[model samples]
Target: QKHRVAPPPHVPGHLIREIDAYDLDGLEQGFHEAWKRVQQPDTPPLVWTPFTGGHWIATRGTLIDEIYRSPERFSSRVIWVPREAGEAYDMVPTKLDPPEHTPYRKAIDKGLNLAEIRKLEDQIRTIAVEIIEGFADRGHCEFGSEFSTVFPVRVFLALAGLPVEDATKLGLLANEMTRPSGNTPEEQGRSLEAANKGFFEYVAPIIAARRGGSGTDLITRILNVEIDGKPMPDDRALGLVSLLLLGGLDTVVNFLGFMMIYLSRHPETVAEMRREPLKLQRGVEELFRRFAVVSDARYVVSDMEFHGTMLKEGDLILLPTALHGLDDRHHDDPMTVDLSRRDVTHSTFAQGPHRCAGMHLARLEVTVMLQEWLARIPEFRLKDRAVPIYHSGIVAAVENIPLEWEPQ
Candidate 1:
């Protein structure tokens, strides 16, 4: 790798080029290089250079863990870019700090206990199998577009007792919310605003129906749950429902898409997983550690100095969980996959109070999907002529991953 030292005026900070600068040709190389540069000691702490807006970068895994743990010093308000950038639009419980954030967190935690997730095991297994069956013998199938994206959307809808017909619409809306494809920030904002309007309009009727009648899904349960000794407001409930949908759908889809591409290229790993299905649990954990798919953003609430550099208050900090996971200091051969590794405290779901609320459900979905799919198609690979393409930013993902395999 090549190293370029910035002048003294640019001391203590490294320049991170804009994501858009990397056209298709640059993306492949730049992604890997960017990951490596952040880990090197000579490289000054990274700062986003493209946009005029300034944000702190957590280049080290330990720093990210500290930031997440200290909610007082580093608040979640304006965590990602401003709503204008189509990231962190609303300050849900996840974006809230202490005292006020506690009640909502408690309510959500009560709903996600192990026993609650166990009850949905059968339903989740059914969904996972059905999704794999759709593309099993096709010889060539676009993993992300067809199954990875739709599977999680359907799972979230079913778990919420939502109608399956709304899956496509919700999927489109979720996509726009996180991965806007518009050329300008204004265009991206337009895309997100339109999606948000459509999403709220569609869910309003469902909320009304649930409130009026007997319902058993997660959404109704949330509606009935008392928060701070009082019922949750309609807007808050709606906000949480929308957040859960985005949380549950986007990350898993990207994860599954990335896994498909990786396994296709590394048959030995796939074979190892198939021979020992029990390893799937650890395998999923290892993959999360290896590919930390989600990026966590925070806002600094106080001025501080760390490693000889000064950090001012209200500075937005972007922690690339993916890059941190790949840091050699954190793992043995961070780039390789090891299904037997036991250290599962990876930042894939993040850490502290804001850790993924749907983690258990996600674990079940990924484990079952991988075990079932590998059992059916023991020998599969990517199409030689087709290239895999990925989408970047807070949520890293592959746009499409075409795979080929023999029928069972």
Candidate 2:
């Protein structure tokens, strides 16, 4: 089959190679290379590449925005290449298109509205502060595992009204879903299945108990919302609840972890944040723009031509926000951490109607995290020379981020 047409001569060869290499999960090097290609003034228009499963890679910010905004043409169904577990088992709102996706979005929004989140703000701050405080004196701690991973999971469980003891279980399940280790489809499928079943079973009793009473928690609130003007089906509700638990748990967990490492490494940024508490809000946006944690993978439902190339129907598209963050089109120096950079744009929470419903809450958590952590430990750094190991493909995170702080 004919691939999409190539861009003008100015586009660099390295960018084309990176898009082509995304399917192999080897796009990191290519991504950096592509950023260099886009930096040149005489470079051709952005080139498109055919990734595995016949997907398109939008190397330029313009094309990325187009795909995200026009979800009807480029549907979210194939958000990511489905594993052996199958696509039907995907998350409710993440995979669902508009109209069908709207209600679920509203339900989740209601639970995480500013007012509700504000009520829990102090509680959330305490949780974040306490976790960081534990490692402040140790002179070193695995930021990813000890603080970043623990804080969000605990806060989410508290919001969901689930037991704190299940935090580890839920976290493990989330990690597997987004970061399966085995190479083959079958092995990955099994891992995902086991994780899903464990998570569902763990939440089953809590869901049941909430159904029995008029509790004021998130699950209870969700139970009351009407989907499509009708009561929500139990199974659908379960799926939505499960998705929220895992998605919210992992996304912010990785985000906070990465942010902590960045701040610790850049002491000046941390000091500035400590002096200006309000900057934490802007810092969250800046950090998100810099990190670009989430990947919005989609399936093309129809044949279309983009950037001079013809894309066939049923092709998969991997929109790595992290890589896109590196594009010079969006920022002056894509790789550098400029907390004060103006005109910053990123798809960290995604774009269009599918943008993260929990964005505001996520930002609040991130803002609070920086605020609290810096206040206590302003001159922290990674304890050892150990590298932070990341789970490949869709998730942007490390398995553990070991860190150490200098004494005040």
Candidate 3:
């Protein structure tokens, strides 16, 4: 690949691992399994991978947590991999560090606060039920394409005051932004630019109409937000809403797909949730731990001896969010998904300054999905001839989750 660079002089040979972040050994088999190939007992806590533009990877959770919490040392400026791609990923709040990031994050938090999400529960459940009923009687459905991807987008549309029918168009663009298919740096740059352009073009008119309007939607709330004692700027508003659109359309869609795949193979876990509905929330947290999907990065701010290894300035450190949850040092029986497990921890929503702003909304989305799905289609399993295709990038996803059950 054109973006690939040789390992720098400071990077020791023992710490080098010829691993491709986008295409891991068992990615075709499973995302977590693919990471397991690198996060082994003998594996170093961190490694220098000359793939996807030569970055360092924190293989253990402790280091990942440290990098996230210590943004003073590891800046959030270039969070994407392939240095060129990360430089181009100029989204608001995510690219900004602590004190500067606070106001924008606070603005986002207001719209998705617990009180706001609580009020939307009925609407959220209504959307979930409508989606489940659409596929319940079909006896089978490709969960990813049919439901997982659609439900969240529709809910996001409803929340943001956008038309629900625009889900497919916006979702395709959001996916491209996260995992562009272009093979070379120039091609990939165009792909990222085009995807971002598409989102801005689609959202600009909506934002213009909502500005200074009395609408009580999420977009309107953001447009009217005051940042650092002044009216939010147009560019910042665009960046914020565009970030929401990309987030709403992508993360949970893939997360739900992975959640269902696991649920399909282990009906006992489904029964466990069904037997004690009150424990469902705990189970959901454990599920999040078991299948943390995002693999974001942080930029090293200066040359320093990090955990006994030399990390030079301007280096990018890939933080595979799942490794923290799967790391055996942090959690015993890390691979096993025990809903009852206590003190479960994972950076699924992330940590420190850039922790996901939509965490509350995401939790609601998953909770409603489980409640309604189990109530309607209680017993479901994966289709015999179906196979799941997994993809890895800034975010990892598994598609083609064909599920089937008896029509009620």
Candidate 4:
């Protein structure tokens, strides 16, 4: 109970549920499964759980939406689940709250806002085709390692004009950053720090080269871009790029891995997509709803009795937007996957002003992967006697998904 920060007097006592959300392998088997169990009639919308050094866990999607929408109460500062992580973590804009958050957010939004990102689809498709071509004839591949993790990252490197050779190194680091392999805090934290250092070390030269004015890559163009009618500070530019690197490397990789794993088992669903192909977009939305994966935490900034729970300043709250998919408050037959689920309301990319600016890019990556792969190798299945291994932490991911296909 060392990490359990007590609630203030105004809140209800029954709001707390004692369970480690990250001890996922042992608890209720998995996140979506555990969330379904937690949403039962007996449970409350929110709870205090001592796991990874304690934090509050919101069980319902409605309340999760409220929390995200209410940034004044719940803040981005001190978002670490592991108490050890707070010491080292700092990515601005996301780590900052409004007013100050507004400028930095807009600064990064220039490159990722939908129209600009949509421009990359043809290039994104090229990388998808190139990646699939590598193993399309091999009959088998570790999808996460060989393709899912590397594809979008290669897209990023091609954008950076950085050597494509660094994609594998960056991919491995991104995997570690999201899904740390260590059994203890020291080892895990060290790995994260190493990744950050490696990224900065890689970018330092690019930053220097671009300062002289070649608007060739995003790194160079950011210097000329401005916010509030003024140029962005160098430090702010570095922060934006840092978060962008992490976002590009980390997010879509996990999603594509999980989504493809689902496809391998449900050939009927794949065949459905193969038959129509136009249905892929709708199917992708349902897949996002059904397999949305995030376990991000936020800190309390001020005292408040939020929906009967007393939140004190400095207390951490783990809000899994993934829960939004399984939440009955927002969807009908929440657990079921319906490709025709129209106007689906789920927080797969989060909510509030800090909502993912690159969401369109991420979605396009998934969309392209499905369109290209099903067109190339529509029939596929898991390797014999193989099961995709999932790791639950800040980001829930299927670390290794071995996939096999009959070469056609």
Candidate 5:
């Protein structure tokens, strides 16, 4: 038997480089620290790092913005690194190119429009309050598992039309898709597939039952829509549903934990919010920039030179969304956590044809969590012995954020 690893394909050594974006030795401190690696004054704007196979890594905000915005040169058809994994992981609409992509995005965009999300505000608070009450009187709980994960998971369940009975099962499945319990790549891939299969199984039945049009759940709303003057079929509907299911629950789940960790460790920020609730809205946007969580990849559509780098069709390019927050060239003191920075801008939710359709809802979730939790909980703090667990991958996350408080 031969142990094998593919060497970087010949693309001119100077134009190609490699990095372990997810590796702990380099990223152990967390999202911000991981990005500080390339923030060095002399770092190249882009480099091709052969980590999970070979791929180009964009290190600056301007470059990442350019790649994402120019979908013609960098196609979303393959939006994951390792390049191969994206092909294996299918999600309708998001991975499709423009003209071909618009209808699927339209269905989701209509469902998550800001006006529609505003209605979810009270519901989001109701659920956040419910989850907090469960622990507010207990004095302490593993904040991440007990509240952070549940808040988003609960909202997702409501929107996905999953019965309350299935929330726990689906929460576990959602974690399997992102924070996998497996020990190896193959194991993790299998677990993710199982989770996706779980969503399809759960969604298909509800979609069928709702074909006659009697529900307002997101799944029902998505499947019932017509695109280009045609009713969507089951296969393609499920494709969009699967993407919505994962996006709805997982990214926000991870982000909530990260935000709570920041607030827990920085009491002064909490004090500012306690002083002025109105400020939390602006604060949430700043924090979104400071602690942005996702970074997606796009495969090259054809061979060409990008800023003097020779590239080939099928090669992957990574757009580090978090870099937009950390690029000192654009923002002052790139690594500082300033909730008051007025001109704060970010690419947390990458820009372009495939930008996340649910970003506004995500902001709403973050704001409500900050408002309700601070008001209800008696000002919490990280457990004396607590240590945040982080997973830096294609989609970065804080795996566990445990905190404690004197019961309200």
Candidate 6:
């Protein structure tokens, strides 16, 4: 009830949806499925929801893209829904807008650029093969716990100059940030607060250790960067590091879970992938389009009419990438994953100047993960009657994807 609010006179009743986009249980039905409920065939490009402190959601692919690109109108100051938590979100570059965001983003790009990620491919593939071989002969495994979480967390720790043994601790904290455990917005806010605090505390000493050091690690590279012609402040450095760490631990991990679920359900795709391995590059693009999981928001800068809706200044607009890639108007049969599709339009990594810094790494990770897993494991399927646990928030995720197959 706390989150419920009456729409202003300009908000037509037809444009309101009562659904809570962050409700994990709601997403368990399926990430795209949940949003599709609100994004009906005839639904407008945008809709307002009273849940999560009353925000407007961009329900169309083009509109979502426009929102991301038009940062002048939609500020990045608050990237999450539920105004209170977004206000408390202090991640640098991600939380900053425009000119102020430029330097930090440049610094981040230095560490995660395509060249750097390409250099890490062999190492990343090694991690993928190592993790897959650990459980491949078991005939069955929970993909999330055994593979997804472990693989990316390990890779992230190696890059961040942290102890890989602590992957479990940091991974859990990253999960809390994404899928806070709470019944109310207030409780979820508290959980998010606690998680952020935990991340700050965890990275503080590490940042201190890397300061003034000539180490060639991600943390060292970021710590050594200049912000506005001055050495980056500890707080700013901490925010950047924490953001990358959380992303490294969570984003690709959840992406893998959803992708694996699809492949398991459609064994033919797996067989096809194995047959034409080179197509996995474009195939990965189609998968990204099919399973885009983020639902970040931006605050309106002024009370302006947008896409036929009156969005007041300070009104939050939710931009779910799932809607963008899944909008049938933009892609032919958006729901079906076609590796051979000529064009794939998506806001999966966002758009404009603030596009994801680690996109290259993420792309490499996904491609390497699929290639390695398919090469090792035979055709697999979900265990009968078992369901994937979906957690929705800033980054949506699937967990407990139980699978079984005849061991090679």
Which of the numbered candidates is closest to the native, going by highest TM-score? 3
- The global Cα lDDT (0 to 1) of model 4 is 0.73
Candidate 2 residue-wise lDDT, 145-188, digit = tens: 67777888888888887788977777778777775544445555
RMSD of each: 4.0, 4.7, 1.4, 2.9, 2.7, 1.6
- Considering lDDT, which of the candidate structures 1 and 4 is the better prediction for this target? 4
Output the lDDT of residue 64, model 6. 90
Clashes of 3: 0
Per-candidate TM equals 0.88, 0.85, 0.97, 0.89, 0.91, 0.96
Model 6 residue runs over 4 Å out of place are: 1-3, 24-26
Ranking by lDDT: 3, 6, 5, 4, 1, 2
- Candidate 6 residue pairs that clash: none
lDDT tens digits by residue: candidate 4, 313-348 = 787788877778878777888866677788577778
Candidate 4 lDDT score at position 298: 80
The 10-residue segment of model 3 with minimum total lDDT is 180-189
Candidate 2 weakest lDDT stretch, 10 residues: 18-27
Per candidate, the number of residue pairs that clash is 0, 10, 0, 0, 4, 0
Cα lDDT tens digits, model 3, 209-273, are 88888899998987788887787887777777889888877999999998899899998989889
Q: Across residues 1-408, which tens digit of lDDT does each residue of candidate 6 receive? A: 345767777688988877687773357688777877777788878888777767888989899999999889999988876777787677778989889899899999889999888999998899999999998999999888898888888888888878888887787788778767665667777888888888899888888888878798888987778877788898788798889888788888888888888889998888888889878877888898888878889999998988778888898888988988888888988878888998888999899888888889889999998888988895899999998877677788887889999998
Candidate 1, which ten residues in sequence have the lowest lDDT sum?
Answer: 1-10
Clashing residue pairs found in predicted model 1: none
Question: Cα lDDT of model 6 overall?
Answer: 0.84
lDDT of 3: 0.86
Cα error, residue 333 of model 4, in Å, equals 3.4
lDDT of every predicted structure (CA atoms): 0.68, 0.67, 0.86, 0.73, 0.75, 0.84
Candidate 2: give the clashing pairs: 4-309, 4-310, 5-309, 10-43, 10-44, 11-44, 55-316, 79-297, 383-403, 383-404
